[PDB]
Structures are given as C-alpha cells and as structure tokens.
Design a binder for this molecule. Structure first.
Ligand SMILES: [Cl-]
Ligand SMILES: [Mn+2]
Ligand SMILES: [Mn+2]
Length: 129
C-alpha cells in the first residue's frame, strides 16, 4: 500500500506512536517518508546480506526472520513478510521494540540524517487528527 501523508499519520496515532518514548508523531511520519516513501511493500538489501522491510525499513539481522540472514535474532518474533502488509500493526509493534533499545530513533539512519533537528511538525500540518 502507498499511504498518503495524513492517512499514515492518522494510522500511526491510532496505534499509539504519538509521543511514544517522547517522539512526536511528525518524527515517525518523516522517518517513514525517507525510509520507504510511505510504501508498505519496500524492500532494500544491505551490504551485510540482511534486508530491510516495509514502511519503517526494519532489518532482518536483528528484528524479523526472512530465512536467508544467518544468525538473525528475530527479536520481534515475526516473519519479515508480515512487515509488508497494508495493515501497519506488525511494523508499529516491532518499531516500538526498536526505539526502546537504547538509541531511540537514531536506529533509523534516515531519521538521524534527514529528520532529526528539523521542523518535524510540518509532516502533520493540515491533517485531521
Ligand atoms: Cl530518546
Ligand atoms: Mn533505509
Ligand atoms: Mn539498510
């Protein structure tokens, strides 16, 4: 599914991401834009042989099992294919475990390089929420 900006913001707020671990909703919308361009089906293969999956580009080395990443830890206890669904529940639930891991949203390199320190409330401007 390719979400619209406000449609994704509403879905994220429904699933309890607004101010989750102190990160306002615009942070999450910004991270999704630059990681997947709001496309639940996005996949990208990394140099280490792992793959990133879905709207928040969750990694197969640590977080989900794709059956081709040796030594995967599968800390979210899910097949990575679950993260490509039009229903964002599985991605949100796994993202909450990632942001809680000690480094906050710095776990998403696009967030650190493109959203951190910017006016992230712009990402939710104009939306009915
Ligand atoms: Cl933090
Ligand atoms: Mn990425
Ligand atoms: Mn990557």
């Amino acid at each position: 599914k390719v979400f619209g900006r406000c449609e994704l913001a509403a879905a994220m707020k429904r699933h309890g991401l607004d101010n989750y671990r102190g990160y306002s909703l615009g942070n999450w919308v910004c991270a999704a834009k630059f990681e997947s361009n709001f496309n639940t089906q996005a996949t990208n293969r990394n140099t280490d042989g792992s793959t990133d999956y879905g709207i928040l580009q969750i990694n197969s080395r640590w977080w989900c099992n794709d059956g081709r990443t040796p030594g995967s830890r599968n800390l979210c206890n899910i097949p990575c294919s679950a993260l490509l669904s039009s229903d964002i529940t599985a991605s949100v639930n796994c993202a909450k475990k990632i942001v809680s891991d000690g480094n906050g949203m710095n776990a998403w390199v696009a967030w650190r390089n493109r959203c951190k320190g910017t006016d992230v409330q712009a990402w939710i401007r104009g939306c009915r929420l």
